[PDB]
Amino acid sequence: TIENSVPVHLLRTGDEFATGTFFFDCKPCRLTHTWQTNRALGLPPFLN
Amino acid sequence: GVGISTGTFNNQTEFKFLENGWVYITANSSRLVHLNMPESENYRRVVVNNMDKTAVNGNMALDDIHAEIVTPWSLVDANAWGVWFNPGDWQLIVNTMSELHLVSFEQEIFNVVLKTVSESATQPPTKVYNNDLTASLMVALDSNNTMPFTPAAMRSETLGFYPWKPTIPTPWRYYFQWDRTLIPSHTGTSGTPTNIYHGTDPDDVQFYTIENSVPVHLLRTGDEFATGTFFFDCKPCRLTHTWQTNRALGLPPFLNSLPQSEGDTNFGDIGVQQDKRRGVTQMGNTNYITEATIMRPAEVGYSAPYYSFEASTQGPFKTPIAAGRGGAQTDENQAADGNPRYAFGRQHGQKTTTTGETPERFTYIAHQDTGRYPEGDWIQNINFNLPVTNDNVLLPTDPIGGKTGINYTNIFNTYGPLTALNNVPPVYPNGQIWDKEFDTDLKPRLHVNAPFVCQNNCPGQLFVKVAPNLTNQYDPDASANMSRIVTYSDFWWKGKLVFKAKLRASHTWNPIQQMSINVDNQFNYVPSNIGGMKIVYEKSQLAPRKLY
DNA sequence: CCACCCCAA
DNA sequence: CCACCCCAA
DNA sequence: CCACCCCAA
DNA sequence: CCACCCCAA
Numbered sequence: 001t002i003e004n005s006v007p008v009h010l011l012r013t014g015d016e017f018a019t020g021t022f023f024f025d026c027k028p029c030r031l032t033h034t035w036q037t038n039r040a041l042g043l044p045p046f047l048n
Numbered sequence: 049g050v051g052i053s054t055g056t057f058n059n060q061t062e063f064k065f066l067e068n069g070w071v072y073i074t075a076n077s078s079r080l081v082h083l084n085m086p087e088s089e090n091y092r093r094v095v096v097n098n099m100d101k102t103a104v105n106g107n108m109a110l111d112d113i114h115a116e117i118v119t120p121w122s123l124v125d126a127n128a129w130g131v132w133f134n135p136g137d138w139q140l141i142v143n144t145m146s147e148l149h150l151v152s153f154e155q156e157i158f159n160v161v162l163k164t165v166s167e168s169a170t171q172p173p174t175k176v177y178n179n180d181l182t183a184s185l186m187v188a189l190d191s192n193n194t195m196p197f198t199p200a201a202m203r204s205e206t207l208g209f210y211p212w213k214p215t216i217p218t219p220w221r222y223y224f225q226w227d228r229t230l231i232p233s234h235t236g237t238s239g240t241p242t243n244i245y246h247g248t249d250p251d252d253v254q255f256y257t258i259e260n261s262v263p264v265h266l267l268r269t270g271d272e273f274a275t276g277t278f279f280f281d282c283k284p285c286r287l288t289h290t291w292q293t294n295r296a297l298g299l300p301p302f303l304n305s306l307p308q309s310e311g312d313t314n315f316g317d318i319g320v321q322q323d324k325r326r327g328v329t330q331m332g333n334t335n336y337i338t339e340a341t342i343m344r345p346a347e348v349g350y351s352a353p354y355y356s357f358e359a360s361t362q363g364p365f366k367t368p369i370a371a372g373r374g375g376a377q378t379d380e381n382q383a384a385d386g387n388p389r390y391a392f393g394r395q396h397g398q399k400t401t402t403t404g405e406t407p408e409r410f411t412y413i414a415h416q417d418t419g420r421y422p423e424g425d426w427i428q429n430i431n432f433n434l435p436v437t438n439d440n441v442l443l444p445t446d447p448i449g450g451k452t453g454i455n456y457t458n459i460f461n462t463y464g465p466l467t468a469l470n471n472v473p474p475v476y477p478n479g480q481i482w483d484k485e486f487d488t489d490l491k492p493r494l495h496v497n498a499p500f501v502c503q504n505n506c507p508g509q510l511f512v513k514v515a516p517n518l519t520n521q522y523d524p525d526a527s528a529n530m531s532r533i534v535t536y537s538d539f540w541w542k543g544k545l546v547f548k549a550k551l552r553a554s555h556t557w558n559p560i561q562q563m564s565i566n567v568d569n570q571f572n573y574v575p576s577n578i579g580g581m582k583i584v585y586e587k588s589q590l591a592p593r594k595l596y
Numbered sequence: 597c598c599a600c601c602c603c604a605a
Numbered sequence: 606c607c608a609c610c611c612c613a614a
Numbered sequence: 615c616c617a618c619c620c621c622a623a
Numbered sequence: 624c625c626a627c628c629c630c631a632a
Contacts, residue, residue, distance in 0.1 A: 005629080020624045027489070034488065035252030039362035040223040043198035043205070044116040047094060047221075062603035068622090074603075154607085191607040254610095261611080276606045487609085505609040553620045594619060 049270025050181050055158025055540060059211040061137045069551030073141065073148075075132040078542035079207055080214050085514050085535050086120035091257065093117045093224060095245070102243055105233035111363050113245060115226030121188065121258050121513045123220040124541065125200030126155070127498075130209035130396060130477020130583055132545050135573050138476055139563040142590060145549045147286045148474075150482060150500050152546035153507050156274040160185055160267050162537040164517070184515035185267040185537055189275065190508035193484070194261045196222040197509070201480040202497065204392040204407075207541075209477050209583050214538070215395060217512050225252035228363045249361075258511055266515065278507045282482060283471075285499040287549075288593035289372070289416035290470055294344050297596045301325075333432050348595065349374070349418030350463035351425075354384045368496050370472060374419025384457075385419030386496070388412050390478040390585065397477060401580035410585045412475045415561075418468075422457040468595070473588040474499045481545075482506060512539075552591060561590045 002008070009017055057078045064072030098112040126132075133141075141148060162183035166176040200206055200218045208215035227246035258264070265273055304319030318325075325337040334341065349371050356367040369386035380387075391407035392398060398408045428434075428441040442448075448456045471494040474481075483498035484506050485491060495501050517533035524530075554560075563586065565573070572584050 018624060022625055025626090030489070033251075035225055035249070035361075036223075037360045037362035038358075038365035039114060040225065042202055043200050043218070044114055044221050044223055045096075045112075045203070046205070046219060047096070047116070047118070060602070064603055069620095072603080156606095189607060190610090192610065192613090193608080194610040196610095256610090274606060278607055281608090485609095503609095505607085505614095508607045510607090555619045592619095 049268060052270070053159060054270065054272040055156060055542060057540065058542060061133060063140070069553070071145070071549055071551065073547035073549060075137070075545045075547065076543060077126065077131050077207075077211065077545070078540065079131070079211060080538065080540045081124065081207070081512070082214055082216055082538045083122055083512060083514060083536065085517075085532070086122065086219075088118075088529065089120050089516055089532075090529065091117060091119060095226065097245060099243060099245075102230060103240070105237050105241060106235050108230065108232050108364060109357060109366070111230060113226065113228055113363060115224040115248070116221050117224045117255070119220040119222075119258065119511075121186075121220045121511045122217040123198065123200060124217040124510045124512050125198075125206050126541075126543055126545075127199050127481050127483075128201050128206045128209075128396070128477065129474055129479050129481060131207050131543070132481075133476070135583060135586070138586065141549065142287060142586075142588065143562045144551060145287055146552040146591070147284050147288070148547055148549040149284045150280045150282055150546075151548050152544065153278040153280065154275050154544050155507075155510060156272070156542040156544075157187065157267070157512075158272045158540050158542070160269050160271060160537065160539045162269065162514075162535060165534045165536070167534075180517065180533070180535060181269055183268070183517055183535060183537070185539065186513040186515050187265040187267055187273045188258050188262045188511040188513070189265075190258075190262050190511065192262075193505055193508055195256050195258075195509065197484040197506075198222060199480055199483055199497070201478070204390075204396045204478065206396055208395050209397065210400075210581055213395075213581075220511060222256065225249055225254070227361060230359070230363055232364075258513075262511070275507075275510075280482065280500070280502060280506075281504050282500040282502045285471070285474060286593070287552075287589055288591050289414065289473075289589040290348075290593055290595040291415070291417050292595035293348055293374075293417060295339050297344050298342075331432070333430065336432075345596070346466040346468050347462070347464060348468045349420065350461075350467045350469070351384075351420055351422065351457075352461050352463065353459055354381070354386075354422070355458070370469060370494055370496055371420065372414050372416035372418035372470065374417050375421040377413050379421060380413075381420075381422060382411055382413070384422045387414075388472075388475055388479075388496075390475065392478055397583045397585070399580050399582045401576065401578050412479075412585060412587075414473055415587060415589050416470050416473070418470055422455070422460070425457060425460075427456065469493070471499060472496050476586060476588065477583045478585060556592070560592060563587075563590065 011017055058076045059078050060076050062074040066072060095115050096113055101107050101110045162180050164178050164180045166178060168174045168176050205218035225248050227249055228244065230243040231241040233241040267273055301318045303316040306316045307314035322338055323335040327337050328343045329337055329341050330343040331341065352369055353367060357364045358367055359365065371385035374385055389409055389411050391409045393407045394400060394402060423444050426441050426443050428436045442456055444455055444457050448454050448459060480498040482500040482502050483495050485501050514535060514537055517535040519531055519533060522530045575581055
């Protein structure tokens with residue numbers, strides 16, 4: 001129940017509700033993709 | 049310049065004994081490398097298609113199709129155990145020490161020599177060797193590891209393990225995105241299954257170039273190229289093995305009855321019935337508390353599919369495994385617990401006074417027992433109600449999928465958040481030392497090729513090449529590839545690898561398994577009347593330890 | 597820039 | 606005079 | 615007067 | 624004027 005657990009701000013017309021600034025502590029996302037399997041790893045054979 | 053020396057030779061193994069059983073192991077390997085002129089001074093892109101082996105509709109693990117690009121640049125790898133120690137040093141670190149730690153690494157190249165070959169077609173004809181004191185050597189360091197990583201240990205294209213023996217770098221090459229499809233097919237599978245070389249996904253086109261990405265240091269005769277000192281930030285390696293399973297964990301039963309005479313035949317009986325024994329089980333059905341039933345804190349090692357040849361966009365490839373032994377090396381499956389296999393020749397073991405093109409190898413079998421005997425398991429009904437009945441138990445012998453040879457063991461994967469594990473021990477000589485790490489957000493817990501896996505960037509590859517020596521005729525607007533002066537160069541390479549490890553104390557009563565010289569070893573560690581040398585493989589972790 | 601089979605009189 | 610695919614630990 | 619199988623958190 | 628199911632980062 002929101003009424004019970006969380007305050008409610010009674011806004012009218014001349015009222016502004018604003019949050020704060022929420023800082024995030026999560027891991028980066030990479031704009032890169034890996035195209036290597038298990039057959040594209042290491043020192044290929046030597047072609048005689 | 050060309051008058052004086054640039055470096056010194058040192059292939060010494062220094063043991064700096066510190067305080068608190070701590071030692072300093074600085075291995076130096078100064079080998080003299082030889083290198084010839086690259087065929088082509090041009091980069092190539094080559095496709096390998098052995099679709100003559102993958103048609104028999106039996107052979108699918110013989111897929112040798114890949115797309116590689118050749119570089120005129122000749123690489124130099126020293127990422128091996130055999131290059132840094134001899135059979136004498138190892139025995140020390142193995143018998144005396146407990147755990148080993150990797151520290152520094154610095155390479156140094158000196159006494160560069162470049163000679164031209166003059167072919168005097170006269171009778172024999174004859175060959176006249178000279179010095180082109182103005183010639184050059186092109187050195188390159190990938191200090192920014194911009195390029196792929198090709199550990200040349202995998203394919204025994206390392207450096208000689210005998211210092212008094214001149215060696216050769218490996219022609220550099222790397223993978224280029226090759227797309228394929230190949231469906232399995234047994235001896236019976238009628239018609240031609242499916243197998244093709246799509247080509248290349250335009251997305252995954254990485255065409256590298258050393259000239260462009262990495263500086264090149266043009267060395268002459270009176271120039272020395274030296275690296276720095278590379279500090280390593282990787283996890284320790286343990287010179288200890290765990291011999292504890294799940295049946296050798298905790299407080300054993302209390303034996304209400306003990307023998308009164310000798311013999312390993314006279315067994316001390318507990319003296320209580322299985323469905324009236326006190327303790328804890330992970331079952332809510334039974335009342336039987338057995339050494340197999342009882343609840344143990346976790347599970348040692350895991351059980352995965354064996355000879356489980358997966359596949360993706362590049363083609364099929366086997367499923368790795370990180371398991372010790374399990375079962376007396378008289379009862380293996382050298383497969384289930386994936387035991388490495390090593391093939392070298394003449395320059396990395398094997399009898400020097402040998403002949404032909406046939407490697408020698410060994411299937412290294414560790415000491416640690418986390419491995420399994422997948423021929424003594426079983427899956428039965430929730431009701432237990434044994435003695436279990438057929439229809440109520442799927443055993444190893446019982447086929448799965450209707451085919452004989454197959455099992456549930458073959459398709460089985462018991463890896464739980466309760467799986468305990470120990471990394472892959474060093475495999476000396478041959479074996480690898482340290483190996484870069486995957487650039488995937490999620491990373492493998494441990495590698496199967498190297499005891500050490502660096503956490504940050506690792507040493508940059510040293511690419512060694514010969515500079516083009518040109519004649520009086522050269523037209524850069526020609527279809528053909530000019531004609532250069534047949535030039536080669538030999539240079540001395542030195543290495544300083546630093547290790548820091550701890551000394552083992554005695555805590556049992558029974559001596560521990562050490563390394564020694566038998567009447568069957570002797571002539572495995574000494575030259576022969578002709579000067580026949582070879583380095584044998586020897587177990588790393590041979591000293592007990594407690595898992596719990 | 598040689599010391600007691602290593603680093604190191 | 607090697608650090609995380611550039612300059613640049 | 616209990617710390618990571620010794621002395622020795 | 625948003626921090627780890629309350630007051631209360």
